[PDB]
Each structure stands twice: as C-alpha cells, then as structure tokens.
Design a protein around this nucleic acid. Sequence first.
RNA 1: GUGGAAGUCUGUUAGAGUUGGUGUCCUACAAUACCCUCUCGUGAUCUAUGUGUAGGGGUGAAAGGCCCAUCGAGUCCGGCA
RNA 2: GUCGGGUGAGAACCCCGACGGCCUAAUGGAUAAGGGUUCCUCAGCACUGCUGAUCAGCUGAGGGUUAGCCGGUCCUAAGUCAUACCGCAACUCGACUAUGACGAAAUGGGAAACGGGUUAAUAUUCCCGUGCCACUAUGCAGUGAAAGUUGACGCCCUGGGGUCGAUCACGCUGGGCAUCGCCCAGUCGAACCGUCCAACUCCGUGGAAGCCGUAAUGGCAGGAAGCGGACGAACGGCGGCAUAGGGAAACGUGAUUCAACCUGGGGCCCAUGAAAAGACGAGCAUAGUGUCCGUACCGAGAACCGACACAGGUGUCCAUGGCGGCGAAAGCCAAGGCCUGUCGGGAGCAACCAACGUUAGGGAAUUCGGCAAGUUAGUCCCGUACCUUCGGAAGAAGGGAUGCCUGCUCCGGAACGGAGCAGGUCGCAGUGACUCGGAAGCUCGGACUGUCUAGUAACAACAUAGGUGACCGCAAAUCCGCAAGGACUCGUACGGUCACUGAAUCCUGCCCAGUGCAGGUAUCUGAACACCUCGUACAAGAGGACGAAGGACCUGUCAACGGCGGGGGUCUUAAGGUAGCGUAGUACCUUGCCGCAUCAGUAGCGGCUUGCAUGAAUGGAUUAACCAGAGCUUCACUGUCCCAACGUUGGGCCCGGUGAACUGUACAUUCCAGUGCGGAGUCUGGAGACACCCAGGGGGAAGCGAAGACCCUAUGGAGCUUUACUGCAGGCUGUCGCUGAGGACUCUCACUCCGGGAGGAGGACACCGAUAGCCGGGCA
RNA 3: CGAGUGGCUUGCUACCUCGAUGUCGGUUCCCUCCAUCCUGCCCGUGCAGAAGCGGGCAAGGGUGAGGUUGUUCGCCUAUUA
RNA 4: ACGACCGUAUAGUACGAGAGGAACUACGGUUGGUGGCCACUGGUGUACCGGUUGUUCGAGAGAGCACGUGCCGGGUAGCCA
RNA 5: CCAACC
Lengths: 73, 56, 237
Amino acid sequence: RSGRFGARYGRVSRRRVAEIESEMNEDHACPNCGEDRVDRQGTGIWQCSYCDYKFTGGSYKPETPGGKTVRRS
Amino acid sequence: TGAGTPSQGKKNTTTHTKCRRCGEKSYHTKKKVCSSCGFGKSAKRRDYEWQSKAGE
Amino acid sequence: GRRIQGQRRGRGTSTFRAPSHRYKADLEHRKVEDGDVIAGTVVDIEHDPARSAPVAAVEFEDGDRRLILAPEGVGVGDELQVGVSAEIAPGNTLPLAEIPEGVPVCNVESSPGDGGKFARASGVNAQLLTHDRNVAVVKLPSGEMKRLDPQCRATIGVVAGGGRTDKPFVKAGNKHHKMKARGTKWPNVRGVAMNAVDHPFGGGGRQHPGKPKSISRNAPPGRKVGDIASKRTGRGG
RNA sequence: GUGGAAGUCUGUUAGAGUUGGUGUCCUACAAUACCCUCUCGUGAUCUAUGUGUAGGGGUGAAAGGCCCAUCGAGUCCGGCA
RNA sequence: GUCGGGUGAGAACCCCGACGGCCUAAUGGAUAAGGGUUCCUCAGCACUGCUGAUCAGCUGAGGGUUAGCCGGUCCUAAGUCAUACCGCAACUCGACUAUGACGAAAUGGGAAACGGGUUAAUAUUCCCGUGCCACUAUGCAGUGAAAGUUGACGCCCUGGGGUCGAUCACGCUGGGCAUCGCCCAGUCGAACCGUCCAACUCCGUGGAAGCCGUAAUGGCAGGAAGCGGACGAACGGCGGCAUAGGGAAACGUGAUUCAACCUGGGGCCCAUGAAAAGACGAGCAUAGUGUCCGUACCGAGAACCGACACAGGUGUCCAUGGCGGCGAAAGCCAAGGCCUGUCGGGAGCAACCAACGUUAGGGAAUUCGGCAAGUUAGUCCCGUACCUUCGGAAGAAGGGAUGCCUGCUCCGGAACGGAGCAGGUCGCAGUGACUCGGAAGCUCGGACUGUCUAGUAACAACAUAGGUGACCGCAAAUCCGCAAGGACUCGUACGGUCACUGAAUCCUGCCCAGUGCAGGUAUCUGAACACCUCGUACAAGAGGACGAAGGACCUGUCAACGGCGGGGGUCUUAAGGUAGCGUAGUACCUUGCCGCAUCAGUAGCGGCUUGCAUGAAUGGAUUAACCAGAGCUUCACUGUCCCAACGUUGGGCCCGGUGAACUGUACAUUCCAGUGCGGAGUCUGGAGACACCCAGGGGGAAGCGAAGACCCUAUGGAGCUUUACUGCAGGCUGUCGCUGAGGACUCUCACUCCGGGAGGAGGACACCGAUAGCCGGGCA
RNA sequence: CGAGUGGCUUGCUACCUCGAUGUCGGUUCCCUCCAUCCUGCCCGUGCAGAAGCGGGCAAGGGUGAGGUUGUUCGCCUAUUA
RNA sequence: ACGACCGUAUAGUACGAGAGGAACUACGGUUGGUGGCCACUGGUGUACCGGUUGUUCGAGAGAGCACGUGCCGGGUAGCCA
RNA sequence: CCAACC
Ligand SMILES: [Cl-]
Ligand SMILES: [Cl-]
Ligand SMILES: [Cl-]
Ligand SMILES: [K+]
Ligand SMILES: [Mg+2]
Ligand SMILES: [Mg+2]
Ligand SMILES: [Mg+2]
Ligand SMILES: [Mg+2]
Ligand SMILES: [Mg+2]
Ligand SMILES: [Mg+2]
Ligand SMILES: [Mg+2]
Ligand SMILES: [Mg+2]
Ligand SMILES: [Mg+2]
Ligand SMILES: [Mg+2]
Ligand SMILES: [Mg+2]
Ligand SMILES: [Mg+2]
Ligand SMILES: [Mg+2]
Ligand SMILES: [Mg+2]
Ligand SMILES: [Mg+2]
Ligand SMILES: [Mg+2]
Ligand SMILES: [Mg+2]
Ligand SMILES: [Mg+2]
Ligand SMILES: [Mg+2]
Ligand SMILES: [Mg+2]
Ligand SMILES: [Mg+2]
Ligand SMILES: [Mg+2]
Ligand SMILES: [Mg+2]
Ligand SMILES: [Mg+2]
Ligand SMILES: [Mg+2]
Ligand SMILES: [Mg+2]
Ligand SMILES: [Mg+2]
Ligand SMILES: [Mg+2]
Ligand SMILES: [Mg+2]
Ligand SMILES: [Mg+2]
Ligand SMILES: [Mg+2]
Ligand SMILES: [Mg+2]
Ligand SMILES: [Mg+2]
Ligand code: NA
Ligand code: NA
Ligand code: NA
Ligand code: NA
Ligand code: NA
Ligand code: NA
Ligand code: NA
Ligand code: NA
Ligand code: NA
Ligand code: NA
Ligand code: NA
Ligand code: NA
Ligand code: NA
Ligand code: NA
Ligand code: NA
Ligand code: NA
Ligand code: NA
Ligand SMILES: [Sr+2]
Ligand SMILES: [Sr+2]
Ligand SMILES: [Sr+2]
Ligand SMILES: [Sr+2]
Ligand SMILES: [Sr+2]
Ligand SMILES: [Sr+2]
Ligand SMILES: [Sr+2]
Ligand SMILES: [Sr+2]
Ligand SMILES: [Sr+2]
Ligand SMILES: [Sr+2]
Ligand SMILES: [Sr+2]
Ligand SMILES: [Sr+2]
Ligand SMILES: [Sr+2]
Ligand SMILES: [Sr+2]
Ligand SMILES: [Sr+2]
Ligand SMILES: [Sr+2]
Ligand SMILES: [Sr+2]
Ligand SMILES: [Sr+2]
Ligand SMILES: [Sr+2]
Ligand SMILES: [Sr+2]
Ligand SMILES: [Sr+2]
Ligand SMILES: [Sr+2]
Ligand SMILES: [Sr+2]
Ligand SMILES: [Sr+2]
Ligand SMILES: [Sr+2]
Ligand SMILES: [Sr+2]
Ligand SMILES: [Sr+2]
Ligand SMILES: [Sr+2]
Ligand SMILES: [Sr+2]
Ligand SMILES: [Sr+2]
Ligand SMILES: [Sr+2]
Ligand SMILES: [Sr+2]
Ligand SMILES: [Sr+2]
Ligand SMILES: [Sr+2]
Ligand SMILES: [Sr+2]
Ligand SMILES: [Sr+2]
Ligand SMILES: [Sr+2]
Ligand SMILES: [Sr+2]
Ligand SMILES: [Sr+2]
Ligand SMILES: [Sr+2]
Ligand SMILES: [Sr+2]
Ligand SMILES: [Sr+2]
Ligand SMILES: [Sr+2]
Ligand SMILES: [Sr+2]
Ligand SMILES: [Sr+2]
Ligand SMILES: [Sr+2]
Ligand SMILES: [Sr+2]
C-alpha cells in the first residue's frame, strides 16, 4: 500500500492512497459479463482480461456514484 | 561556477558570419539577419544618424 | 516597479503556454445534416493529455474516424448515435429537446452547433431539469440554473474519470508531472515573499501584505491581486 | 516464501554539487584556481544540440537572483562639450 | 630520469639502445562543435618556446584531402522567414488567417559496401577481390495495386534466443625461462547470397469439473494439457563467399558466463511518452546512368573558449583487457601512449614556510566552539532501548568471528558460483596493504525529497503536498497589444484564475468602530449633452429643472487589513486575549528563582512564570521520520593543550641561464626628549654614529594598494513606499455619433454572435469613435 | 568642610586626520610606572605567644591553573609566599 | 642569573593558667627562571634488520609499485626533554 | 565596558 511511502507524508495522505488503490486493484465484475477480471489500464481506463472488454470508468474505480445513477433515470 | 573564465569555455556556437551582402562578419546565422547592413531584415541598407556626431 | 507574474502570463510566451503540439483532439460533437442516420462504433479508449480523463475513438458509418468526449461506461465495440432521433442511452448525443427531463448530461453546447462547452471535466455532469418549446433548463456542475436553447446538443451520462480529485497528489513531483501537461507556470511563490518591486504585497521586515487583500473590480492589471472583488472572506458568519 | 515498490538507503560508477579547513593561492596556473573533508546520485534528476522570451522589458521554487567578467533597470552609439 | 652512442660549429632537455619510471573512463582509440593548414617533406634558428636547442604547433619552399552505397543533399520537430490579407502617421514594426519555403552533419526519420592492399601525407573515396541500391532502356513474366503493414517511439522489473569479449578443458604452431614445469602469444577469415527458427498470434484435433504453466503474474467447457498445422527473429547458427584475403607458423575443437543484436511476460500514470518523407505490399535478365558539396590535421595540462603553449572550461562512443573485490571502487598489471602537468647544477641540504610521518606520561586542561587531527570501519553470527504517523527508529547500542594448509559435506545443470565441516598450522597484527560508520542522550528550527544569493550567506529563507478564502457559466474570470489581434484554450467548475497558510495529528476564541471589498439605499449630495429662465437682434455668461456611477446612510464580511488596553467592583477606539505555550531564535530588568550536572556552569535541560513587549492559517500546540541547519551533555580517541622533539618531500641558501612588477618631491646612519596644525629620520637640545655587503623575522616610515563604503554637507543621482504634490494609463458610469420602424414598450433593417449551409440567437442594445463624473502608486 | 595630584573611567571641545592612521576581547613578544599583592628590612598596637590590624623604606624577583560568558569587568573552584 | 617555598634539628622549647605555640642558626628537598650536556630513562631515527597484505616479474630465489616507509615490529649514530 | 548612526 502506502508502505512504499515509508515514514513520509503522514497518516491521511497515505491512508487514502492505500484505500483508493486498494479498492482500485480489487477484482471487479466485468460489465461485458460477470467475471472479476477488470484491471485499470491508465487513468479512467479499464479492461477485462477475460473478454478483453476495454471501457471507461472512474479514475480509481470502474464505476462511480454518479455513473451508477445514469442507469436509473 | 564563475561567470568569468570558467564560463568562457562553453562558447563554441557560431552566430555572426560573413554577410553575403556587405562582406562584414555580421550575418547572424541563427537569425539570418545582418547586424551591420540589415540584410535579411530590410531591402534598404541599415543606417542611422547616430553613427556620427549630430552636426557632422 | 516591475510587471507582476499575472502580467507576464498574457504575453503568451513558452513558459505560460499549454503543450498544444502534444494535445490529441478537439472533442466537439459531429455535425449532422439531419435524420440522426449517423452511428459509429467505439474502436478504442485513449488518454486525453489535456484533461487527465479518457476519450473514445469512434468510427462512424460514413467513414469518419474521430475522438469523442466519453461519458463513464463506454467501451470498445459499443455503438453510439448522434442526431435528433438518436436513442436515449449513455454515450449518445442529441438536442436537449429530445432528451427526457431528469437525465444527467455532459458536454452541453452553449449555442446550438458550437460542439459543446459545459460539463466536460472528469466525472462531472449537467442535469437536464425543465423542457419547453422555447427554453431548456439545465443545472450545471457549479449548481447554477442555466437557460439554454432546446436545440443545444448534449451527451447522455456523466463524464468518465470521476473521483480523480479524491486522491491527494502526496508529492510535489506528482503535481509537477500534471502541471507539465497544462498551460500553467508552477510552482507558486507567494506575493508576500517577494520584493516590493515585484508585487503589491512584497517588502517589509517580516512577511505580510501591507494592505487589505480585497481589491476592487476596477483595479488595473498589476494591482488586481489578492482577493478580487470578494463579496466576503473567511469562513465565519 | 514469492514479488520488487520507493521525489527510499549506501556509494569519488557516470554525472551533478560544494559544509568545513575561515588550509594553499591571493603582481595567482586562474579577473573565482588547487587539495582534503563534505552533499546529491531513478528523479520536482543530470546533460548535449536546436528553438523561444529583450531592457521599465524578459526570466526568476524570490536571492533584487539572472539576461555574454556588467544589473535596485544590459550593451553600443547618439543627445553631449 | 640515468649510462653509453648518433648528428652538429655548438647538445641536460633533437635522435638510437639499454636500464629506471609515469598514464588505465585516461596521459590510450574514434569523433561533435570550434580552429583553419596547425597535416607531410626538405632546408633553417633572427622571431615564438618559462633555461638550451641541431628540435617544434616557429621561419622559408614545396606537397597533401579522390566516394552511386560515410556525411550533406531528402523528410518533417519545437519553431523561423517570405508572399497575400489586416493594423500603423509610417516602416526595416505588429498578432491572426491562407499559401510557399526554411528548420536535425556527433545525437530524430532515412535506398545501397564489405574485406584486403597501397602513400611521406587520403582512403568503406585510390587499387584488387566480392557484393549491393535506385532510376532509366530492352526483353520475358505480370494484371494484380490498395486495403493493410512499416517508418513509429515512455518509465520500472524480468524470462527466453544469442555474437564479441573473458575464462575453463584438450590439441597444434611460435616465444620466454632454466633446480621445478611453468609462463606468454597465436591458432584468423567480412559484406553479401542461401538456408534454419525461438517468442507472439492463430487453426485442426482433443475433452480437463481440477488440472496446465511461470522467475513472477497467471490459463481454461466462452474449451486446459497432449498431438498436428499456418504465420513467424537476430548485427545469431549453418553452407557458399574462400586453391578471396591474411599469417613466419599452426592455420583448433568443446564448454561456461554471455555486452551487441533478436523476441517475449509483468508493473506504473490526476504524467500517456513526435511528425513527415520514404519503404513493404509488388517477379526476373542484360545494359546504361548515379551529377553537385564535405573529406587533411587538432579535438586539448600546447591546434577549441578563456589576451598565453592558462592546473580553468568544453558534448559523444570505446561501460566486457588480466589479478582483485559486491563493483564501471582502491591498489597492481597489459594493449596503447608518454618521460612536455618541460629550466638545470650544488650544500646531510641551517633559520623559516608548504604538504606530511612518528611522538613518553597526562587526555580537551587548548578554543567562542574538539576548529584541526584522530577514533570507528569490510563481511558473518549473536543481540538491540526510548519513541512511533507502525513505515520506522536500526548498521541503535553491546558482544563474538575473520589467514594459511590438508581432506571433505550441502545447494545448483554448472561456473574459473555460493553456504558450511573436520584436522593441521604461522604472526605483535588475518577487512594484515588497499577499500572501509565513531557512538549515545537532551533542546531549538523547518515536516519530508527538492530551491537559492554565477564571484564572502545553503540556512530557520523559497518550494512542496495538505488546509483555506476570493473571482468566473465560457460572448466568462484573469492577463498581453496603440491597433489588427493574442495567452489561458485541442481547456469548461472533479475547471483555472487570484491570493494566504504550509505534511499528518489535536485545534483554530472575542472584535465589523477605522480601513478594504461587496450588497442595498426612502431621503441628501452628485458632471456633461439635451431642456427651461434671465442675459446677448446672435454668442460669451448667470441661474434652474432632471440626476448615472460614486459618496452620505444601512447591511454583510477577519483563514480581509488589522486589533484583543488603562482604570474600577466602565473609559478610548469595535472587542479586552479564550485553548495552548511561556525568561522563548520574543523577557529590558537578567547571571530571574528552584532543581539537575560540574571542584567550580552569565551555558544547557526540567519546573515556576505577574508575558518590558506570547497566542491561535499575521496560524497556536504538538510531533515519528529527515538534516553539510543552531545550542548542550556523555563514552571512546587523540600533540588542541601541558611542551615541545626528531624525521620525510618541495621550497628556502650557493652556482649557470632566463628575467618581470609594485613603488620613487627631495635629502636621508639614527636614538632620547622637546617643539610644532596638539601623532617629527629632516625643526631645537643632547646622545650615538668608520664604509660596504649577506641572511632574517617584520618595530617605525601615522608603509604600499583604493579621491572613506561610516558621518555630514549639495536648493546632487537612483531604486522603493504611501491616505505627500501633480499628472498618466486602466476600470465603472452618463451623454453624443454608429442608429432604423411602430418613463414604460413592441418590432426588424443596420450591427453582433452561433451555424458547413439553410437558418438560429440577439438587436438599435452591445462593440467601436467622442466626451463628462468617480475610482485610480498599476505607471510617470 | 577645606586644599590638591594623576590622566586608568566618563563627560566636554572640535585642534590634527575623511585622495582611510582597520575598531572590542583574546593571543604572542618586548620595555616601563608605583599609588606595593608576595618576598627583604622596619614602626605602632586594643603588641604574652601564634596570629591579626595599621603604618614606613623598597619596583630585585614573583604574581600561576581552572568553570559560565565574545566578553573587559565580574561571579565561582581548588591550589599559592 | 638567580627568585621563592616546604621539611628536619632548634622544640612541643621560649611565651601562656590552658588552649595554642615561635626565633637565631645548621641542614635536606621542591618550585619558577637560567646556561649547558646525552653515561642513564624517554622520543625520533622514510640508516638499517625482520614480519606480512594486494599485484607484477612463470614458480623458487630476488625484487618494483601501493607517496614520496604499503602496512606492522625492533632500533645504531645523531638530534632532543 | 566595548567595537557610529538612533
Ligand atoms: Cl491541479
Ligand atoms: Cl562527414
Ligand atoms: Cl516470461
Ligand atoms: K578620517
Ligand atoms: Mg474538443
Ligand atoms: Mg510547462
Ligand atoms: Mg508558495
Ligand atoms: Mg527576500
Ligand atoms: Mg531583502
Ligand atoms: Mg509595488
Ligand atoms: Mg537549450
Ligand atoms: Mg589518416
Ligand atoms: Mg604546459
Ligand atoms: Mg605523546
Ligand atoms: Mg582557557
Ligand atoms: Mg571536525
Ligand atoms: Mg549437487
Ligand atoms: Mg535556545
Ligand atoms: Mg528543510
Ligand atoms: Mg555566494
Ligand atoms: Mg545545504
Ligand atoms: Mg496550498
Ligand atoms: Mg488549494
Ligand atoms: Mg509562512
Ligand atoms: Mg516557510
Ligand atoms: Mg532556562
Ligand atoms: Mg483567528
Ligand atoms: Mg505571515
Ligand atoms: Mg572619496
Ligand atoms: Mg549610507
Ligand atoms: Mg531621488
Ligand atoms: Mg466568429
Ligand atoms: Mg513614484
Ligand atoms: Mg576640526
Ligand atoms: Mg595605513
Ligand atoms: Mg612608595
Ligand atoms: Mg624592574
Ligand atoms: Na509479502
Ligand atoms: Na567546501
Ligand atoms: Na532599461
Ligand atoms: Na543468416
Ligand atoms: Na573483473
Ligand atoms: Na626542456
Ligand atoms: Na534525495
Ligand atoms: Na471593522
Ligand atoms: Na497578536
Ligand atoms: Na535537507
Ligand atoms: Na604532530
Ligand atoms: Na617593518
Ligand atoms: Na538606487
Ligand atoms: Na588634576
Ligand atoms: Na586586542
Ligand atoms: Na619589586
Ligand atoms: Na573566567
Ligand atoms: Sr571551474
Ligand atoms: Sr556550447
Ligand atoms: Sr525579415
Ligand atoms: Sr537610415
Ligand atoms: Sr471548441
Ligand atoms: Sr468548431
Ligand atoms: Sr509586504
Ligand atoms: Sr469565526
Ligand atoms: Sr534517492
Ligand atoms: Sr548517495
Ligand atoms: Sr568559512
Ligand atoms: Sr587539512
Ligand atoms: Sr580568492
Ligand atoms: Sr540501481
Ligand atoms: Sr554578467
Ligand atoms: Sr556624450
Ligand atoms: Sr645560434
Ligand atoms: Sr608536425
Ligand atoms: Sr531542409
Ligand atoms: Sr542521423
Ligand atoms: Sr531512458
Ligand atoms: Sr541469457
Ligand atoms: Sr580523417
Ligand atoms: Sr582523439
Ligand atoms: Sr582538460
Ligand atoms: Sr605498455
Ligand atoms: Sr623547453
Ligand atoms: Sr619508527
Ligand atoms: Sr573543551
Ligand atoms: Sr575549557
Ligand atoms: Sr562490532
Ligand atoms: Sr510547526
Ligand atoms: Sr547555483
Ligand atoms: Sr557557499
Ligand atoms: Sr498542519
Ligand atoms: Sr467594515
Ligand atoms: Sr491566559
Ligand atoms: Sr640635530
Ligand atoms: Sr623576508
Ligand atoms: Sr592621508
Ligand atoms: Sr617611590
Ligand atoms: Sr611583607
Ligand atoms: Sr559582566
Ligand atoms: Sr620547624
Ligand atoms: Sr597541644
Ligand atoms: Sr615508495
Ligand atoms: Sr588498517
């Protein structure tokens, strides 16, 4: 996690980096199916290694609270 | 690093060269403008009244 | 004294210019005669240097290959539509008039056909509220109610890359890299830390502005610094 | 155990720099040099060439620093005896 | 460097040999810029050369640079210019928009050349051998031809293929050494043509419900392994090239580790890592054409820049030569280069100085201060506190081990790789040289890496992430231009402009009276044009009515400038200092008082604290980590000291040669007193004093060097400030023109904006010209 | 209260020096003064002695090491004739 | 070119109720200063002899280099305290 | 003490 930051920057700064990157690298359910093989390819870009589905999402998560809203309305 | 002698060693750039128009080594090969006769800047020849005393 | 940094900026010298020769493309909506008979397929998702957000390359029916301001949830293979009769789905563009009320939109045109001006930044969106035959009411990201011509085109959904702002830069070096992709001079030296000759706040034994910071709107350039025409300051009240 | 992150550590690798000696020099080797010690050395890093910004103007992580040994306003000639 | 010798009229320094040394990322090899003939030969020594000179980068005279395939030339990059258009009083000026051109010689892209021979000096250029590319012609084949591919690309980790080099094993050829049998060198051979293909991707078969696979991640019924197949690599292997070339000769064979080069897998980005010409796609024979420019040499402790043959500065590649060791480290040594970081001779060679070695006992007593010097040191094993943001602190600390020889064990395919065991054994000392941390505690500051005063400041200053406030919906906010126009901006509030504070953590009190900003405003005040009255046959002018912004007045606002006292159990002027911290990097008093520590402590640390004159983003407190930052203490150690000595190298001294500068009113062998514009070698009185020369450390010449940087004076200069004087940009606002029709309104036709266009939005407004009022250190 | 001497402090003056006489403390090295701290020789005593206290001659010699502080001075410690 | 001090004998004496406690003189030593000298002790001693690390000369022998001794041990003369 | 101005 933020252990690469050593004893620098302080709690918060490297506390959020940990979580953000933690929820960032988890196995995500692919939209083009339901597999947990989605990985980030860069800022806001995700791809499912299973079916090769490359798509747009949040900067650190594949879906955002606002993105999940579009669906509804 | 001193601005004097040690900084003089880095000078190996060619800027002013012999001008095709006037023959003076004043044609800036980077600007392609002669600082002596104005070649590359003006068709007219570079001239100024301050190149001599006012009443002469 | 000497011109302040804000004044050096305006001359548009290299130091203050944006790395335009490195920018990818102008994400303006397509121009359709009419009919909406224009559809394309998302051929790829790319990184947009100028916005730190992703953009999508689309191949349209008539052979036109162009980058588009992508909303969240768009992927390769997906089909997008642009026109009056376009379908009401994420990633599709059509005039506000055709958009159902209560639908989040992005890259909204200011004047019909301008290509899009509003809500284009990471994870943002305008909210189409009211319809009409003469005026479409949109709620922009800043919370402002904007009256627009119903003929103003827009894209359904929110902009991709949301949350970008939720993570701290942590290091000066990270700010550094981002700044190198913008038309901005960075880092920032405080006015109070300069010599009197360089800024209204410069000079003095210890650092401190030797004057109130709230400056008048009518102040000339060179003097308009600090808190410009502030209606108020602080957190109190 | 694997893995190999890091404006991460050691390091006269290259390279960059310069804390102290208030050493040597001070009609100098040198109009900013020499030696030892010392700091940085995967990054906001260092570096070559090309290119751009010009004088009340630039450029400045700001020291009134720098803009050809010259800067609290360059240099040249002129105003000017 | 030395001994011999060569040449010469002349030899320490020109040449030969020997012996002795120096340089190893350079003192060697190839080059970029830049220089410009410095290159080669012959003949010279008046000039230049730190002495000499027969020598030379010097002087005289000649000579030398050879290209289809190495650069240029071609392409486009940041960006530049030209023309058109527009602005400007105007232009050699100026932004945009079109078009054209320009813009890369090591080091961006790019059609094609290798090996050897030759010259005093060139050489992938000439010559020999072999090969290749493009275009054009002719002939055969071909109808395909443009879709696609390539040119074409970041950072970090890593697998596989693989050449050179190096090393190991054995053979062959030659050399060296002379108790042994060792040691060294060589053992060669290109472009190109042909051929081979790992990886990746894909296809067939197959049928895994737990197997397949990696250094690691991973893969699969949406089809795993296995089997077969398509496509498909090296500057690589293999064959030719080659009874080519090269070598005195032999003219090897295998292996390991493997730079180059080839090809894959993984990870990172609030960062996304060029473009274009060109090439491929798209066969072959023979022939012809391939012009133009560059080509020497230096590339640096003498060919460049620095006035110099300057200890400075100056890019690239040789990053794989041997031992060593972790190593592109030290040290030693090859290939190669040099004795030119170019004056010599002499004295046991004194004083004194620069570098440096060794010092008994004491051990920081020295000093502002351990400044300087030293101590420690590599690697392995054991062991490691407070505190902490749980990362760290940490190599904490502290303790032990370390060579050689003989024979072995373990890991691994193996190394000329690594980890151990047993026995034997030497020294004062086994990281034996070299390389190579001294350690600990308390406090202050700044969180951290980072920045800076080229040339006296590296810090606590600047930056920073983080916190905060302000402006702005884009025909915007902010900013540049006289204008035409422009930056921000291929940007759009998760934006970016303007400011303040300065990581995290816990917090951030009271004050809106003054000043600033902003909002509102019945009434008051408030300019010009038009309008009305008076005046004038007109005009000047006087007065009136209307009244915009602005001000009065009201309100909001302190993470806005800033403020938080005196008196009494309110007063000025709004409030009257809260949490914290506190004798502070702020406390004058002050060496405050108590304690700690010391023989003794104006220091330091802890506590108290009425704070001359602490205090909350003018941020307060606190704080792990970090630091060439400030202060204090301890252990260790030591010539810092007691108290100095001896030694080493280079100078100093004498000799040959070369050969400056600073300074100079005059006189001048002075000393003690006095006098004098009161600080005299020179005046007065005495004293002393034979001349000259060498060495010395510097008492005096108010020594030399610089028309005092302090201070004052001048109706001197400049930079800076502001509620100084006076003005000028600029912004807001009214009015007039642009400007049209029917104190409130509709319309469309100018004009503006959006749109490719149709058309849409707006609209007599806005923009622009003129003028009036307000603000106006932004500027003079 | 009165009379003086010195020229270490401080003040006063503006005579010398602004085409410069480098500034505190310390250090090192040399000479000197006496208004004597010790040492020699004396006088007095509220001088038994021992020792103090005060005074006279006297400048030959000596007057040291350390803790805080840049400090001078001073405060402090152990030695000392 | 010598200054000063301590100690012993005088003497537990003179003096004094006691407590306490001298001197003349004769001696031994210390300290500061001074001049000289090296038998003794100590330092140095890149004369010299030895041990030994890396590397090179093939090993051996014998040597160079590692800053003007690579490092370590001993140390004659001389010079010194 | 003192090394200028406060
Ligand atoms: Cl940002
Ligand atoms: Cl070339
Ligand atoms: Cl792999
Ligand atoms: K003076
Ligand atoms: Mg766009
Ligand atoms: Mg930039
Ligand atoms: Mg700042
Ligand atoms: Mg400053
Ligand atoms: Mg300043
Ligand atoms: Mg100012
Ligand atoms: Mg450059
Ligand atoms: Mg040659
Ligand atoms: Mg030389
Ligand atoms: Mg000693
Ligand atoms: Mg002392
Ligand atoms: Mg030191
Ligand atoms: Mg094994
Ligand atoms: Mg302090
Ligand atoms: Mg810091
Ligand atoms: Mg400096
Ligand atoms: Mg520093
Ligand atoms: Mg900030
Ligand atoms: Mg911020
Ligand atoms: Mg600050
Ligand atoms: Mg700061
Ligand atoms: Mg204290
Ligand atoms: Mg506050
Ligand atoms: Mg401040
Ligand atoms: Mg003067
Ligand atoms: Mg002054
Ligand atoms: Mg002035
Ligand atoms: Mg337009
Ligand atoms: Mg002014
Ligand atoms: Mg006077
Ligand atoms: Mg003088
Ligand atoms: Mg007397
Ligand atoms: Mg005397
Ligand atoms: Na792990
Ligand atoms: Na230094
Ligand atoms: Na100027
Ligand atoms: Na081949
Ligand atoms: Na090696
Ligand atoms: Na010579
Ligand atoms: Na660092
Ligand atoms: Na107020
Ligand atoms: Na305050
Ligand atoms: Na630092
Ligand atoms: Na010494
Ligand atoms: Na003198
Ligand atoms: Na000035
Ligand atoms: Na007197
Ligand atoms: Na002094
Ligand atoms: Na005396
Ligand atoms: Na003292
Ligand atoms: Sr230099
Ligand atoms: Sr250069
Ligand atoms: Sr021109
Ligand atoms: Sr003219
Ligand atoms: Sr646009
Ligand atoms: Sr457009
Ligand atoms: Sr200020
Ligand atoms: Sr408040
Ligand atoms: Sr680092
Ligand atoms: Sr380092
Ligand atoms: Sr210094
Ligand atoms: Sr030194
Ligand atoms: Sr100097
Ligand atoms: Sr590394
Ligand atoms: Sr300069
Ligand atoms: Sr003049
Ligand atoms: Sr001659
Ligand atoms: Sr020559
Ligand atoms: Sr060109
Ligand atoms: Sr090239
Ligand atoms: Sr790189
Ligand atoms: Sr390999
Ligand atoms: Sr050549
Ligand atoms: Sr060379
Ligand atoms: Sr050099
Ligand atoms: Sr050699
Ligand atoms: Sr010479
Ligand atoms: Sr010795
Ligand atoms: Sr000390
Ligand atoms: Sr001391
Ligand atoms: Sr140890
Ligand atoms: Sr702080
Ligand atoms: Sr610098
Ligand atoms: Sr410095
Ligand atoms: Sr904070
Ligand atoms: Sr107010
Ligand atoms: Sr209080
Ligand atoms: Sr006389
Ligand atoms: Sr002298
Ligand atoms: Sr004078
Ligand atoms: Sr007397
Ligand atoms: Sr006495
Ligand atoms: Sr005092
Ligand atoms: Sr006695
Ligand atoms: Sr008794
Ligand atoms: Sr030696
Ligand atoms: Sr050692």
